[PDB]
Amino acid sequence: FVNQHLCGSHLVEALYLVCGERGFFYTPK
Amino acid sequence: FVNQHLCGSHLVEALYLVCGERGFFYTPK
Amino acid sequence: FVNQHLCGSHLVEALYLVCGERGFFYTP
Amino acid sequence: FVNQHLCGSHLVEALYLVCGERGFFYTP
Amino acid sequence: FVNQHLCGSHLVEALYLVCGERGFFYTP
Amino acid sequence: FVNQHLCGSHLVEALYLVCGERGFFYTPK
Amino acid sequence: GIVEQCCTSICSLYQLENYCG
Amino acid sequence: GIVEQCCTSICSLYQLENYCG
Amino acid sequence: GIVEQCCTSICSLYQLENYCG
Amino acid sequence: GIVEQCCTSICSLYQLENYCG
Amino acid sequence: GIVEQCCTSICSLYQLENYCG
Amino acid sequence: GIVEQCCTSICSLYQLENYCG
Ligand SMILES: [Ca+2]
Ligand SMILES: [Ca+2]
Ligand SMILES: [Ca+2]
Ligand SMILES: [Cl-]
Ligand SMILES: [Cl-]
Ligand SMILES: [Zn+2]
Ligand SMILES: [Zn+2]
Incomplete structure (x- = not known):
């Protein structure tokens, strides 16, 4: 894929930036 | 900071590759 | 898209390296 | 250095996402 | 293209991480 | 470190751009 | 999921905030 | 300049938005 | 602009230089 | 914390895998 | 060549390791 | 090597070209 x-x-780099101290989850298909 | x-x-880019379909939940301090 | x-x-990362101290204006 | x-x-990459259709100037 | x-x-970033101290050869 | x-x-990303179809060897030793 | 929502049409930074912890 | 403002003391996304077109 | 030029067909380092300051 | 464990000494790809979800 | 092998069908980390020095 | 030459002092793209294939 x-x-x-x-x-x-690119999504993970953007979430890292947008989410800051909140962190984030990346759950692909 | x-x-x-x-x-x-760079860590989240590394996790993206290493974790693959598993995904990840990035938490900072 | x-x-x-x-x-x-990627274009702006390339411009950063190519343009050096001249900098650049990214006009999308 | x-x-x-x-x-x-990294600054240029973040400006790309933050600024969107406005574009940006990178002056260093 | x-x-x-x-x-x-993206291939060269992944090669950098995977190969570590071995280095790598990128040849299109 | x-x-x-x-x-x-970042070096390998610059090398990717500079060298083009020539490719390159990353020899970090 | 984020791939369905954001990998064929562009997500704004506000839209991406939905995936923060 | 953005380097002086943001590479010693970190800049928020709002502070970065100062440099948009 | 640079997107219309360099995303439909690949741009050399010199072609990118035309967008510098 | 991944930052505390991995931002001054290098973490192996193996060690990073411990942070996958 | 790596582009032919990995830019139409995705390559695993193991297949990428084929190109290490 | 490249690391010793280019991580303690900035290398121009021309210097980086030495490491090209
Ligand atoms: Ca990046
Ligand atoms: Ca990257
Ligand atoms: Ca990059
Ligand atoms: Cl860095
Ligand atoms: Cl891409
Ligand atoms: Zn990309
Ligand atoms: Zn970096």
Whole structure:
């Protein structure tokens, strides 16, 4: 799933930034 | 706080790769 | 389109390296 | 120095996401 | 194409982490 | 040293851009 | 999930805040 | 300049938004 | 702009330089 | 904490796996 | 070559390790 | 090596080109 992998890579970097001290969860398909 | 922020940015990218389908829940302090 | 969004992310990282001390204005 | 160069790489990536369609200027 | 350039950018980050002190060869 | 580990992560991304179709060897020794 | 919501159309940073802890 | 403001003392996302177009 | 130029077809380092300050 | 364990001494890919969910 | 092997079908970390020095 | 040369002093893209294939 190359597109989904590239998307998730950028999603985690954005969540890290947006969520700050709250942290976040990444749950792929 | 800058070095910890930069470090954590690379850690979540590493977790993304290592954890794969399992996903992860990133918590900072 | 998400793919164009991810492309732009890489473009600005490239501009950072290529432009050096000149900097750059990213105008999407 | 290097630590400042690496900081800037991350700054540019965050500006990309924060600024959206407004774009941004990167002046260092 | 662009898709190959963007995929390769992520390949080299993954190679960096996986290979560690061995290093690696990136050859398209 | 983590800061050296983070530096190498950016080095390989710059090498990717600079070298293009030439590719490159990352020899961290 | 976040891949369904955000990997074919763009999610704003406000939308991404839904996945914070 | 953004480097002086944000690479010694960390910048919030609001502070970063100061540099948008 | 740079997106229309460099996301539909790949841009050289010199082509990216045209967007510098 | 992953930050405390891994941001001044390098963590192996093995050690990081302990943080997967 | 790695691009042909891993940019149309996804590669695992084990398959990536094929390219370590 | 690259690490000793480029992590204590900033390397230009031209210096980085030495490590090209
Ligand atoms: Ca990044
Ligand atoms: Ca990255
Ligand atoms: Ca990067
Ligand atoms: Cl991508
Ligand atoms: Cl860094
Ligand atoms: Zn990408
Ligand atoms: Zn970094």
